[PDB]
Coordinates of C-alpha atoms (C1' of nucleotides) and ligand atoms in Angstrom, one line a residue:
Chain P
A1 CA 34.2 -0.1 -19.4
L2 CA 34.6 -1.6 -22.9
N3 CA 32.8 -4.7 -24.2
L4 CA 34.4 -7.0 -26.8
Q5 CA 32.1 -5.4 -29.4
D6 CA 33.3 -2.0 -28.3
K7 CA 37.0 -3.0 -28.7
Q8 CA 36.1 -4.7 -32.1
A9 CA 34.4 -1.5 -33.5
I10 CA 37.3 0.7 -32.3
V11 CA 39.9 -1.7 -33.9
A12 CA 37.9 -1.2 -37.1
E13 CA 38.1 2.7 -36.8
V14 CA 41.8 2.7 -36.1
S15 CA 42.4 0.2 -39.0
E16 CA 40.0 2.3 -41.2
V17 CA 41.9 5.7 -40.7
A18 CA 45.2 3.7 -40.9
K19 CA 44.4 2.5 -44.4
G20 CA 43.3 6.0 -45.4
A21 CA 46.3 7.8 -43.8
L22 CA 49.5 8.7 -45.7
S23 CA 51.8 8.8 -42.7
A24 CA 51.8 8.1 -38.9
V25 CA 53.8 9.1 -35.7
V26 CA 53.7 7.1 -32.4
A27 CA 54.7 9.0 -29.2
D28 CA 54.5 9.0 -25.4
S29 CA 51.5 10.9 -24.1
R30 CA 52.5 10.8 -20.4
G31 CA 52.9 13.8 -18.1
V32 CA 51.1 16.4 -20.1
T33 CA 48.0 18.5 -19.2
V34 CA 44.7 18.2 -21.1
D35 CA 45.1 22.0 -21.8
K36 CA 48.2 21.5 -24.0
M37 CA 46.7 18.3 -25.4
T38 CA 43.5 20.2 -26.6
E39 CA 46.2 22.7 -27.9
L40 CA 47.8 20.0 -30.0
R41 CA 44.2 18.8 -31.0
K42 CA 43.5 22.4 -32.3
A43 CA 46.9 22.4 -34.0
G44 CA 45.8 18.9 -35.1
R45 CA 42.5 19.7 -36.8
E46 CA 44.2 22.7 -38.3
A47 CA 47.0 20.5 -39.9
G48 CA 44.6 17.8 -41.0
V49 CA 46.0 15.5 -38.4
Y50 CA 43.9 12.7 -36.7
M51 CA 45.0 12.4 -33.0
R52 CA 44.5 9.4 -30.9
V53 CA 45.4 7.7 -27.6
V54 CA 44.6 3.9 -28.1
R55 CA 45.2 0.7 -26.2
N56 CA 48.3 -1.2 -27.1
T57 CA 47.1 -4.8 -27.7
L58 CA 44.2 -3.1 -29.6
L59 CA 46.7 -1.3 -31.8
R60 CA 48.4 -4.6 -32.6
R61 CA 45.1 -5.8 -34.0
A62 CA 44.4 -2.6 -35.9
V63 CA 48.0 -2.2 -37.2
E64 CA 48.0 -5.9 -38.3
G65 CA 45.8 -4.1 -40.9
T66 CA 49.0 -3.2 -42.8
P67 CA 51.6 -1.7 -43.6
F68 CA 52.3 -0.3 -40.1
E69 CA 53.3 -3.7 -38.7
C70 CA 56.9 -2.4 -38.1
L71 CA 55.3 -0.3 -35.3
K72 CA 54.2 -3.3 -33.1
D73 CA 57.2 -2.9 -30.8
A74 CA 56.6 0.8 -30.5
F75 CA 53.4 0.0 -28.6
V76 CA 55.2 -0.8 -25.4
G77 CA 54.7 2.3 -23.3
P78 CA 51.7 4.7 -23.4
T79 CA 50.7 5.2 -27.1
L80 CA 49.6 8.5 -28.7
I81 CA 49.4 8.2 -32.5
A82 CA 49.1 11.1 -35.1
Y83 CA 47.8 10.0 -38.4
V84 CA 48.0 12.7 -41.1
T85 CA 45.1 12.0 -43.4
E86 CA 45.8 15.2 -45.2
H87 CA 49.5 15.6 -46.3
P88 CA 52.3 13.4 -45.1
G89 CA 54.4 15.2 -42.5
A90 CA 52.7 18.0 -40.3
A91 CA 52.5 15.3 -37.6
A92 CA 56.3 14.7 -37.3
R93 CA 57.2 18.4 -37.6
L94 CA 54.4 19.3 -35.1
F95 CA 55.3 16.6 -32.5
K96 CA 59.1 17.4 -32.2
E97 CA 58.3 21.1 -31.6
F98 CA 55.5 20.2 -29.1
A99 CA 57.8 17.8 -27.2
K100 CA 60.6 20.4 -27.2
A101 CA 58.0 23.1 -26.2
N102 CA 56.8 20.9 -23.3
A103 CA 60.1 19.0 -22.6
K104 CA 57.9 16.2 -21.3
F105 CA 57.3 12.7 -22.8
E106 CA 59.2 11.2 -25.8
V107 CA 57.9 10.8 -29.3
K108 CA 59.6 7.4 -29.9
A109 CA 59.1 5.8 -33.4
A110 CA 57.6 6.8 -36.7
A111 CA 56.4 4.9 -39.8
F112 CA 56.4 5.8 -43.5
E113 CA 56.5 3.8 -46.8
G114 CA 56.0 0.6 -44.7
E115 CA 59.2 1.1 -42.6
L116 CA 59.9 2.4 -39.1
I117 CA 61.9 5.5 -38.5
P118 CA 64.2 5.7 -35.3
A119 CA 63.7 8.7 -33.0
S120 CA 66.6 11.0 -34.1
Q121 CA 65.9 10.4 -37.8
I122 CA 62.2 11.4 -37.7
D123 CA 63.6 14.8 -38.9
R124 CA 63.2 13.1 -42.4
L125 CA 59.5 13.9 -41.8
Chain R
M1 CA -3.6 3.7 14.0
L2 CA -5.8 1.0 12.5
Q3 CA -8.7 -0.5 14.3
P4 CA -12.2 -1.9 13.3
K5 CA -14.8 0.9 13.1
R6 CA -17.4 -1.3 14.7
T7 CA -17.5 -5.0 15.7
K8 CA -20.1 -7.7 16.3
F9 CA -18.5 -8.6 19.6
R10 CA -16.2 -6.7 22.0
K11 CA -13.9 -9.5 23.0
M12 CA -12.3 -12.7 21.6
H13 CA -10.8 -16.1 22.2
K14 CA -7.1 -16.2 22.3
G15 CA -7.1 -18.6 19.5
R16 CA -4.1 -20.2 17.9
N17 CA -1.9 -19.2 15.1
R18 CA -1.3 -22.2 13.0
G19 CA -0.7 -23.3 9.4
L20 CA 0.4 -21.0 6.6
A21 CA -0.6 -17.7 5.0
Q22 CA -3.1 -16.7 2.3
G23 CA -2.2 -13.8 -0.1
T24 CA 1.4 -15.0 -0.6
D25 CA 1.7 -12.9 -3.8
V26 CA 2.1 -9.3 -4.7
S27 CA -1.2 -8.3 -6.4
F28 CA -0.9 -4.5 -6.6
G29 CA 2.6 -3.1 -6.3
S30 CA 5.8 -4.2 -8.1
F31 CA 7.4 -5.1 -4.7
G32 CA 6.3 -6.4 -1.4
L33 CA 7.5 -7.2 2.2
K34 CA 6.7 -10.8 3.0
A35 CA 6.9 -12.3 6.4
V36 CA 9.0 -15.4 6.9
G37 CA 8.2 -16.0 10.6
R38 CA 4.9 -16.3 12.5
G39 CA 3.7 -13.7 15.0
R40 CA 1.1 -11.1 16.1
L41 CA 1.2 -7.6 14.7
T42 CA -0.1 -4.8 16.9
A43 CA -1.6 -1.8 15.2
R44 CA 1.3 0.2 16.7
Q45 CA 3.9 -1.9 15.0
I46 CA 2.2 -1.6 11.6
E47 CA 1.7 2.1 12.0
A48 CA 5.3 2.9 13.0
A49 CA 6.5 0.8 10.1
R50 CA 4.3 2.4 7.5
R51 CA 5.7 5.6 8.8
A52 CA 9.3 4.4 8.4
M53 CA 8.8 3.5 4.8
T54 CA 6.8 6.7 4.1
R55 CA 9.8 8.8 5.2
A56 CA 12.0 6.5 3.1
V57 CA 10.3 7.1 -0.2
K58 CA 9.9 10.9 0.3
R59 CA 6.2 10.4 -0.2
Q60 CA 6.6 9.1 -3.8
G61 CA 5.4 5.9 -5.5
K62 CA 2.6 4.1 -3.6
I63 CA 2.3 2.0 -0.5
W64 CA -0.4 -0.6 0.3
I65 CA -0.9 -2.2 3.7
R66 CA -2.3 -5.7 3.1
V67 CA -2.7 -6.6 6.8
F68 CA -5.3 -5.5 9.2
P69 CA -5.3 -5.7 13.0
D70 CA -8.9 -7.0 13.6
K71 CA -8.6 -9.1 16.7
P72 CA -8.8 -7.5 20.2
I73 CA -6.4 -8.4 23.0
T74 CA -7.2 -7.9 26.6
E75 CA -5.2 -7.3 29.7
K76 CA -6.1 -7.3 33.4
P77 CA -4.1 -4.4 35.1
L78 CA -1.5 -4.9 37.8
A79 CA -2.3 -6.2 41.3
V80 CA -5.6 -7.9 40.2
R81 CA -6.4 -11.5 41.1
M82 CA -7.6 -14.1 38.6
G83 CA -11.2 -14.4 37.6
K84 CA -13.8 -11.6 38.0
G85 CA -14.3 -11.8 34.3
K86 CA -12.2 -11.3 31.2
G87 CA -9.7 -8.4 31.0
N88 CA -10.4 -5.1 29.4
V89 CA -9.5 -4.5 25.8
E90 CA -6.0 -3.1 25.4
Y91 CA -5.2 -3.1 21.8
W92 CA -5.6 -4.7 18.4
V93 CA -3.6 -7.2 16.5
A94 CA -3.3 -9.0 13.2
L95 CA -2.4 -12.7 13.2
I96 CA 0.5 -13.3 10.9
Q97 CA 1.5 -16.7 9.4
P98 CA 4.6 -17.5 7.5
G99 CA 4.2 -16.1 3.9
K100 CA 1.8 -13.2 4.3
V101 CA 2.5 -10.0 2.4
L102 CA 2.5 -7.1 4.8
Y103 CA 3.1 -4.2 2.5
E104 CA 3.1 -3.7 -1.2
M105 CA 4.8 -1.0 -3.1
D106 CA 5.4 0.4 -6.5
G107 CA 6.2 3.5 -8.6
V108 CA 9.7 3.4 -7.2
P109 CA 13.3 2.2 -8.1
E110 CA 14.0 -1.3 -6.8
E111 CA 17.1 -0.4 -4.9
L112 CA 15.3 2.3 -3.0
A113 CA 12.5 -0.1 -2.2
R114 CA 14.7 -2.8 -0.7
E115 CA 16.0 0.0 1.4
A116 CA 12.7 1.3 2.6
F117 CA 11.7 -2.2 3.4
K118 CA 14.7 -2.8 5.5
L119 CA 13.9 0.3 7.5
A120 CA 10.2 -0.8 7.7
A121 CA 11.2 -4.2 9.0
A122 CA 13.4 -2.8 11.7
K123 CA 10.1 -1.9 13.4
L124 CA 8.6 -5.4 13.1
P125 CA 8.7 -8.3 15.6
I126 CA 8.9 -11.0 12.9
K127 CA 11.3 -12.4 10.3
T128 CA 10.7 -10.8 6.9
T129 CA 12.0 -10.7 3.3
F130 CA 11.8 -8.8 0.1
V131 CA 9.8 -10.0 -2.9
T132 CA 8.9 -9.1 -6.4
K133 CA 5.5 -9.7 -8.2
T134 CA 5.7 -12.3 -11.0
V135 CA 3.9 -13.2 -14.1
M136 CA 1.7 -16.1 -13.0
Chain B
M1 CA 35.4 3.1 20.9
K2 CA 31.8 2.5 20.3
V3 CA 31.2 -0.9 21.9
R4 CA 28.1 -2.6 20.6
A5 CA 26.5 -5.6 19.3
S6 CA 25.9 -4.3 15.8
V7 CA 29.0 -2.9 14.2
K8 CA 29.2 -1.4 10.7
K9 CA 31.2 0.6 8.1
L10 CA 30.4 4.2 8.5
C11 CA 32.3 5.4 5.4
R12 CA 34.4 4.1 2.6
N13 CA 37.6 4.1 4.7
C14 CA 36.3 1.9 7.5
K15 CA 37.8 -1.7 7.4
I16 CA 36.4 -4.6 9.2
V17 CA 38.7 -7.0 11.2
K18 CA 38.5 -10.0 13.4
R19 CA 41.3 -9.7 16.1
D20 CA 41.5 -12.4 18.7
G21 CA 38.0 -13.5 18.1
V22 CA 36.5 -10.0 18.3
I23 CA 35.0 -8.1 15.4
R24 CA 36.1 -4.5 15.2
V25 CA 35.8 -1.7 12.7
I26 CA 39.0 0.2 12.1
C27 CA 39.3 3.6 10.4
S28 CA 42.3 5.5 9.2
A29 CA 40.2 8.7 8.6
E30 CA 37.9 9.1 11.5
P31 CA 38.9 8.0 15.1
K32 CA 35.1 8.3 15.9
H33 CA 34.4 5.2 13.8
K34 CA 36.6 3.0 15.9
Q35 CA 34.4 0.1 17.1
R36 CA 34.5 -3.1 19.0
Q37 CA 31.8 -5.8 19.4
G38 CA 30.4 -6.4 22.9
Chain G
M1 CA 13.6 -21.9 -26.5
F2 CA 13.3 -23.9 -23.3
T3 CA 13.9 -27.6 -23.0
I4 CA 13.0 -29.4 -19.7
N5 CA 14.1 -32.9 -19.0
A6 CA 11.8 -35.1 -17.0
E7 CA 10.9 -38.5 -15.6
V8 CA 7.6 -40.3 -15.2
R9 CA 6.4 -40.5 -11.7
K10 CA 6.1 -44.0 -10.3
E11 CA 4.5 -42.8 -7.1
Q12 CA 1.9 -40.3 -5.8
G13 CA 0.5 -38.6 -2.8
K14 CA 1.8 -36.4 -0.1
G15 CA 4.7 -38.7 0.9
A16 CA 6.0 -39.2 -2.6
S17 CA 5.9 -35.4 -3.1
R18 CA 7.8 -34.5 0.0
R19 CA 10.5 -37.1 -0.7
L20 CA 10.7 -35.6 -4.1
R21 CA 11.1 -32.1 -2.7
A22 CA 13.7 -33.3 -0.1
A23 CA 15.8 -34.8 -3.0
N24 CA 15.9 -31.3 -4.8
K25 CA 13.3 -32.5 -7.3
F26 CA 9.7 -31.5 -7.7
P27 CA 6.4 -32.8 -9.1
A28 CA 4.4 -31.3 -12.0
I29 CA 1.7 -32.4 -14.4
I30 CA 0.9 -32.5 -18.1
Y31 CA -2.8 -32.4 -19.1
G32 CA -5.1 -31.0 -21.7
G33 CA -5.9 -32.4 -25.0
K34 CA -7.5 -35.7 -26.1
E35 CA -4.9 -37.6 -24.1
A36 CA -4.7 -38.8 -20.5
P37 CA -2.7 -36.8 -17.9
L38 CA 1.0 -37.4 -17.4
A39 CA 2.6 -36.8 -14.0
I40 CA 6.3 -36.1 -14.0
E41 CA 9.2 -34.9 -11.9
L42 CA 11.8 -32.3 -12.6
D43 CA 15.0 -30.8 -11.3
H44 CA 14.1 -27.8 -9.0
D45 CA 17.2 -25.8 -10.0
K46 CA 17.1 -26.0 -13.8
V47 CA 13.5 -24.9 -13.9
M48 CA 13.8 -22.4 -11.1
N49 CA 16.5 -20.6 -13.1
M50 CA 14.5 -21.1 -16.3
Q51 CA 11.3 -19.5 -15.1
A52 CA 13.6 -16.8 -13.9
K53 CA 12.9 -15.4 -17.4
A54 CA 9.4 -14.1 -18.3
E55 CA 8.9 -15.8 -21.7
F56 CA 8.7 -19.1 -19.9
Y57 CA 5.1 -18.2 -19.0
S58 CA 4.1 -16.8 -22.5
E59 CA 5.7 -19.5 -24.7
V60 CA 5.6 -23.0 -26.1
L61 CA 8.3 -25.1 -24.4
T62 CA 9.3 -28.7 -24.7
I63 CA 9.6 -31.5 -22.2
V64 CA 11.8 -34.5 -22.8
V65 CA 10.2 -37.6 -21.3
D66 CA 11.6 -41.1 -22.0
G67 CA 13.0 -40.1 -25.3
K68 CA 9.8 -38.3 -26.2
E69 CA 9.1 -34.6 -26.3
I70 CA 5.8 -32.9 -25.6
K71 CA 5.1 -29.3 -26.5
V72 CA 3.3 -27.4 -23.7
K73 CA 2.6 -24.0 -22.0
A74 CA 2.8 -22.9 -18.4
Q75 CA -0.7 -23.0 -16.9
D76 CA -0.3 -22.2 -13.2
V77 CA 2.4 -22.7 -10.6
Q78 CA 2.2 -23.0 -6.9
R79 CA 5.2 -21.7 -5.0
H80 CA 6.4 -22.5 -1.4
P81 CA 5.1 -19.7 0.8
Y82 CA 8.3 -17.9 1.9
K83 CA 11.0 -19.8 0.2
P84 CA 12.6 -19.2 -3.3
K85 CA 11.0 -22.5 -4.3
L86 CA 8.5 -24.2 -6.5
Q87 CA 5.9 -26.7 -5.2
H88 CA 4.3 -27.5 -8.5
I89 CA 3.5 -26.7 -12.1
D90 CA 0.4 -27.3 -14.2
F91 CA 1.4 -27.9 -17.8
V92 CA -1.2 -27.6 -20.5
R93 CA -0.7 -29.4 -23.8
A94 CA 0.2 -26.9 -26.6
Chain D
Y1 CA 48.5 32.5 -11.5
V2 CA 44.9 33.7 -10.7
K3 CA 41.6 34.5 -12.4
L4 CA 38.7 36.9 -11.7
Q5 CA 35.6 38.3 -13.5
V6 CA 35.7 42.1 -13.3
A7 CA 33.0 44.6 -14.5
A8 CA 33.8 46.5 -17.7
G9 CA 35.7 49.8 -16.9
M10 CA 35.9 49.0 -13.2
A11 CA 38.5 48.0 -10.5
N12 CA 39.8 48.5 -6.9
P13 CA 36.9 47.7 -4.5
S14 CA 38.1 45.8 -1.4
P15 CA 35.9 42.6 -1.4
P16 CA 36.0 41.6 -5.1
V17 CA 39.7 42.3 -6.3
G18 CA 42.3 43.8 -4.0
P19 CA 42.8 41.0 -1.3
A20 CA 42.3 38.1 -3.8
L21 CA 45.2 38.9 -6.1
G22 CA 46.8 41.2 -3.5
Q23 CA 47.9 38.4 -1.2
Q24 CA 49.9 37.0 -4.3
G25 CA 52.4 40.0 -4.5
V26 CA 50.6 41.8 -7.3
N27 CA 50.6 45.7 -7.5
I28 CA 46.9 46.5 -7.3
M29 CA 46.5 49.8 -9.2
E30 CA 48.4 48.9 -12.4
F31 CA 46.1 45.8 -12.8
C32 CA 43.2 48.0 -11.9
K33 CA 43.7 50.9 -14.4
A34 CA 45.5 49.1 -17.2
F35 CA 42.5 46.7 -17.0
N36 CA 40.1 49.7 -17.2
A37 CA 42.3 51.1 -20.0
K38 CA 42.0 47.7 -21.9
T39 CA 38.4 47.0 -21.0
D40 CA 37.1 50.5 -21.4
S41 CA 35.9 49.0 -24.7
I42 CA 33.7 46.4 -23.0
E43 CA 30.1 47.6 -22.5
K44 CA 29.2 49.0 -19.0
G45 CA 27.7 46.3 -16.7
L46 CA 29.2 43.2 -18.2
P47 CA 31.6 41.3 -16.0
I48 CA 34.7 40.5 -18.3
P49 CA 37.0 37.6 -17.2
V50 CA 40.7 38.5 -16.6
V51 CA 43.5 35.9 -16.3
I52 CA 46.3 37.3 -14.2
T53 CA 49.8 35.7 -14.7
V54 CA 52.2 36.4 -11.8
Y55 CA 56.0 35.6 -11.9
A56 CA 58.6 35.3 -9.1
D57 CA 59.4 39.1 -9.6
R58 CA 55.7 40.3 -9.0
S59 CA 55.6 41.8 -12.5
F60 CA 52.4 40.4 -14.0
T61 CA 51.0 39.9 -17.5
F62 CA 47.2 39.5 -17.7
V63 CA 45.1 38.3 -20.7
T64 CA 41.7 40.0 -20.6
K65 CA 39.4 37.5 -22.4
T66 CA 36.0 38.0 -23.9
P67 CA 32.9 38.4 -21.6
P68 CA 31.4 35.1 -20.3
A69 CA 28.9 32.9 -22.1
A70 CA 26.4 33.8 -19.3
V71 CA 27.0 37.6 -19.6
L72 CA 26.8 37.8 -23.4
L73 CA 23.6 35.6 -23.0
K74 CA 22.2 38.1 -20.4
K75 CA 22.9 40.9 -22.9
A76 CA 21.9 39.2 -26.2
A77 CA 18.4 38.1 -24.8
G78 CA 18.1 41.7 -23.4
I79 CA 17.7 40.5 -19.8
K80 CA 19.5 41.3 -16.5
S81 CA 19.4 38.1 -14.4
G82 CA 18.9 34.7 -15.9
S83 CA 16.6 32.0 -14.5
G84 CA 16.5 30.8 -10.9
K85 CA 14.7 27.8 -12.4
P86 CA 16.4 27.1 -15.8
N87 CA 14.4 25.3 -18.6
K88 CA 11.5 25.2 -16.0
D89 CA 11.2 29.0 -15.8
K90 CA 12.7 30.6 -19.0
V91 CA 13.8 34.2 -18.8
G92 CA 14.7 35.5 -22.4
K93 CA 15.4 34.8 -26.1
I94 CA 18.2 34.7 -28.7
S95 CA 18.0 33.9 -32.5
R96 CA 20.9 31.8 -34.0
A97 CA 22.7 35.0 -35.1
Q98 CA 23.3 36.0 -31.4
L99 CA 24.4 32.4 -30.6
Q100 CA 26.9 32.9 -33.4
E101 CA 28.0 36.5 -32.3
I102 CA 28.6 35.4 -28.7
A103 CA 30.3 32.3 -30.3
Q104 CA 32.6 34.5 -32.4
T105 CA 33.6 36.5 -29.3
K106 CA 34.0 33.0 -27.7
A107 CA 35.4 31.7 -31.0
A108 CA 38.3 33.9 -29.7
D109 CA 37.6 32.3 -26.2
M110 CA 36.7 28.5 -26.9
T111 CA 38.3 25.1 -27.5
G112 CA 35.8 24.5 -30.4
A113 CA 36.5 23.1 -33.9
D114 CA 33.9 25.1 -35.8
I115 CA 31.6 28.1 -35.0
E116 CA 29.0 25.3 -34.7
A117 CA 31.0 23.9 -31.8
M118 CA 31.3 27.3 -30.2
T119 CA 27.6 28.0 -31.1
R120 CA 26.8 24.7 -29.4
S121 CA 28.8 25.5 -26.2
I122 CA 26.9 28.9 -26.2
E123 CA 23.9 26.6 -26.8
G124 CA 24.8 24.7 -23.6
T125 CA 25.2 28.0 -21.6
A126 CA 21.8 29.0 -23.2
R127 CA 20.1 25.9 -21.7
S128 CA 22.0 26.4 -18.3
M129 CA 20.5 29.8 -17.3
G130 CA 17.1 29.0 -18.7
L131 CA 17.1 31.3 -21.9
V132 CA 15.2 30.2 -25.0
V133 CA 16.9 30.0 -28.4
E134 CA 14.6 31.5 -31.1
Chain C
rA1 C1' 44.5 -4.8 -6.2
rG2 C1' 49.0 -2.0 -6.4
rC3 C1' 52.2 1.5 -8.6
rC4 C1' 53.4 5.9 -13.2
rA5 C1' 50.3 9.7 -15.7
rG6 C1' 46.1 12.9 -16.8
rG7 C1' 41.0 14.2 -14.0
rA8 C1' 40.2 19.4 -19.6
rU9 C1' 37.1 24.4 -22.3
rG10 C1' 32.5 27.5 -22.2
rU11 C1' 32.7 28.8 -16.8
rU12 C1' 32.9 31.9 -11.4
rG13 C1' 26.2 27.6 -15.7
rG14 C1' 22.1 30.9 -13.9
rC15 C1' 19.6 31.9 -9.2
rU16 C1' 21.1 33.9 -4.3
rU17 C1' 24.5 36.2 -1.3
rA18 C1' 29.0 41.3 1.8
rG19 C1' 31.1 36.2 -0.8
rA20 C1' 28.7 30.4 -3.6
rA21 C1' 33.9 30.2 -8.0
rG22 C1' 31.9 21.6 -8.8
rC23 C1' 31.4 21.4 -3.4
rA24 C1' 25.5 27.2 2.0
rG25 C1' 21.2 27.1 -0.4
rC26 C1' 17.5 26.8 -5.4
rC27 C1' 17.1 25.1 -10.4
rA28 C1' 18.9 23.3 -14.7
rU29 C1' 23.1 19.6 -15.6
rC30 C1' 24.1 21.1 -21.6
rA31 C1' 27.8 21.4 -25.2
rU32 C1' 32.9 21.4 -26.7
rU33 C1' 38.5 19.1 -27.2
rU34 C1' 38.1 13.9 -25.8
rA35 C1' 42.1 8.0 -24.2
rA36 C1' 39.1 9.8 -20.4
rA37 C1' 37.3 14.1 -17.2
rG38 C1' 30.1 14.1 -12.8
rA39 C1' 28.0 22.0 -14.4
rA40 C1' 31.3 17.0 -9.6
rA41 C1' 31.9 11.9 -4.8
rG42 C1' 34.5 14.1 -0.1
rC43 C1' 38.4 17.5 2.8
rG44 C1' 39.2 22.7 2.1
rU45 C1' 38.4 28.8 1.7
rA46 C1' 35.6 35.1 4.0
rA47 C1' 34.7 33.2 -1.3
rU48 C1' 39.1 31.1 -4.0
rA49 C1' 43.2 28.5 -4.1
rG50 C1' 44.9 23.8 -2.3
rC51 C1' 43.8 17.7 -1.7
rU52 C1' 41.7 12.8 -3.5
rC53 C1' 37.5 10.5 -6.1
rA54 C1' 34.3 9.1 -10.6
rC55 C1' 36.8 8.1 -15.7
rU56 C1' 40.8 6.8 -18.9
rG57 C1' 46.1 5.5 -21.0
rG58 C1' 50.5 2.9 -19.1
rU59 C1' 53.1 -1.3 -16.1
rC60 C1' 51.5 -6.0 -14.3
rG61 C1' 50.2 -10.9 -15.5
rA62 C1' 45.5 -15.1 -14.4
rG63 C1' 41.7 -15.6 -12.6
rU64 C1' 38.3 -11.9 -9.9
rC65 C1' 33.4 -9.5 -8.2
rG66 C1' 28.7 -10.1 -5.1
rG67 C1' 24.4 -11.8 -4.5
rC68 C1' 21.1 -16.6 -3.7
rC69 C1' 20.5 -21.4 -1.2
rU70 C1' 22.0 -24.3 2.7
rG71 C1' 25.9 -27.4 6.9
rC72 C1' 28.7 -26.3 11.4
rG73 C1' 30.7 -22.4 14.3
rC74 C1' 31.7 -16.4 16.4
rG75 C1' 29.9 -11.9 18.8
rG76 C1' 25.0 -10.3 21.2
rA77 C1' 25.9 -13.2 26.8
rA78 C1' 26.2 -9.6 34.1
rG79 C1' 24.9 -11.7 40.6
rA80 C1' 25.3 -12.6 44.9
Ligands
MG201 MG1 -9.8 -24.2 16.8
MG202 MG1 -8.3 -18.4 6.1
MG203 MG1 45.4 -8.5 23.5
MG204 MG1 -4.9 -41.8 -2.1
MG205 MG1 1.8 -37.8 6.3
MG206 MG1 43.7 -2.2 -12.1
MG207 MG1 32.7 -16.7 -12.2
MG208 MG1 27.8 -17.0 22.5
MG209 MG1 30.7 -8.1 31.8
ZN210 ZN1 35.4 5.7 8.6

RNA sequence: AGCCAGGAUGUUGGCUUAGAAGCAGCCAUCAUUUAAAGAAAGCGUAAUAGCUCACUGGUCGAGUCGGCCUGCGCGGAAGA
C-alpha cells in the first residue's frame, strides 16, 4: 500500500515534473494491454515524454501546483498523463494515433498555456 | 524416552501437586511453551511432543526441554487384590504446576514457532500457552 | 459430510455458518469440505 | 519518555495487595538513595502497555506522586505465573 | 498466435514442432523450411525463438527473433549447459563486452531504454543460470 | 467488500526430462517497461494453451481489520 508519506513524496514528484514540463495531455488508460503500454513508453522515452498513471485526488494536490488547475475536472475517470518535458506536442500527436491505432480508451482533455483544450480540438497540439 | 539413569530409591510416595511453578521465564530460547494448567507429564507425552515440534521446524533452530520426568509411578496389574506390597514401577512422570516452561526454542521465525508449539501441545494433557522471553 | 466435533476451513473458499444452531462449513469449490458439527 | 501516575499506599500486606489486584491496580515500590522507601499503587493497564516496549527497562522514567515527580529506573519485576499480568515492580531511585 | 524455440537450421520432428502449431491449422513444411531459410544464419546448436502469427485463413506470418538470453549466455561463456545450482555452483564466464553483444542482439529483442537496461536484463539471465560476469 | 480495467519483457531463467514453457522435480529468483505485475498463490496441458490470485488505476463513499483480557451462552453429549 501507500503511506501518507508515500503519497506526499509522489505528489511532490508529479508537481516537480509538472513545473518543469512545457505541455501535458490527460487520457483514459483503461482496456489496454501492458505490451502496447510499454510500446507507448518506448515511443515515450523516444519523444522526450514523461508517462504516468497517477491517483486522482493525488493529482488535484499536485496540479494545485499550477498552472494545470483547469484539468481538475479531467481527473474523473482513470488518469494517464503525458508530460512532454522536451518539446511541447509529441504527446498530443502520439496519443491520438495510439488511441486510433488501439481504438480503445478515450484521450479526454489537454492543457497548454494555462488553459484546457476540449477533445476534438487537441489537434491544435 | 527420558528416565533417570540411576536413583537413590526405586519407588515413591504419590505426593501431591500443589502451589505454583518455578522457572516461569524463558532463559535460553526466544520463545517457550508455558503450562497454564496443572498435571503430570509422562515421559511418553514429552517425547511424542518433542517429536512433533521437531518435525515442525524441519530440524532447524534449537529446542530445549526444561522438564524432566523424575518421579516413578507404579501399577498393580489386573486381577490382583489389595496389599501384598507396593505395585511395580510402570513409568516415569514430571509434576507440572501452573506456569512451568515445558520447552524453549529459538533460531526460528516467530510465526513458525507458534505453529510448532500448537502441534506440540496437541500431544499434551494440560492447558498451555505461547510466551516470549523478556528483558528483565 | 464430515460430521465431527472440530470443524475447520480447509481452504480459502470454505465459509463457516451457523444454521439452526449447528455450526457447518460450506464450500463452493470442494464438496469434500462439507462439514457439520456433531 | 514514560510518565507513570501513582498514589501512595495507605495499606499493606497480602490482603491489601490482593484487593489492589482485584481492582485492576497493582503495588510497586520506590527505594534506593538517601531517602526512605515509598510504596505506591499503579494502573495495571497503562504500565502493562508501557513495559510492552523495551526501553522501559533501560531508561530513566518519571513517577507522578501527589503532584511530585521522582526519577527512577526499573529494577526487577515479578509477573503472575501464567497470566499476561504484573504482580509487582521494584523501582530504584535514579 | 503461438510461440516456440527451434534449433538453428532445423525443423519438422514430431514431438517439438509439428503437433504444437499443427493443431492450429498451420501448414507445417512452409514454416519449417522458410524458418531454416531465415535462420540458416543462426549458428548450429542455438535454439532461436520464433513467434508464429496465424490468421482465420491459415496463412501465417512469423517473426523469428534473436536467440534467447540463456542461449547467447551458454555460447558467450563457451559452455553447453548452465548451472543446475545457479550462483551456488557457477558454470562459466562473460566480460561486459559479451553482456553488451548479447544485449545488442536483445537490444533488437528487449523492452529496455538503454543498452545498460538490456545489459542488465542479460545480467539478470546471467545470474539466473549461474554464470559469472567477468 | 462489490463492480470496470490491466496482471507486462528478457524468457520456454538454468538444471532435468520423450515433454517442465510461473505451476513433476532441483537450484537460483535477477533485471527491464512500470500505476502495478511473485522467474508466480491455485485449476489446467503429453508439454503448451486456457482460468483466477498476489499487485495496481478507476467507480464507491465512512468507518474497517484481528489479536489480547474477561462476563454469560452453543456444539462436543448414546441405553435398556
Ligand atoms: Mg507433604
Ligand atoms: Mg521447589
Ligand atoms: Mg431443517
Ligand atoms: Mg504484618
Ligand atoms: Mg489471607
Ligand atoms: Mg476495495
Ligand atoms: Mg480502530
Ligand atoms: Mg451441551
Ligand atoms: Mg445420537
Ligand atoms: Zn474448501
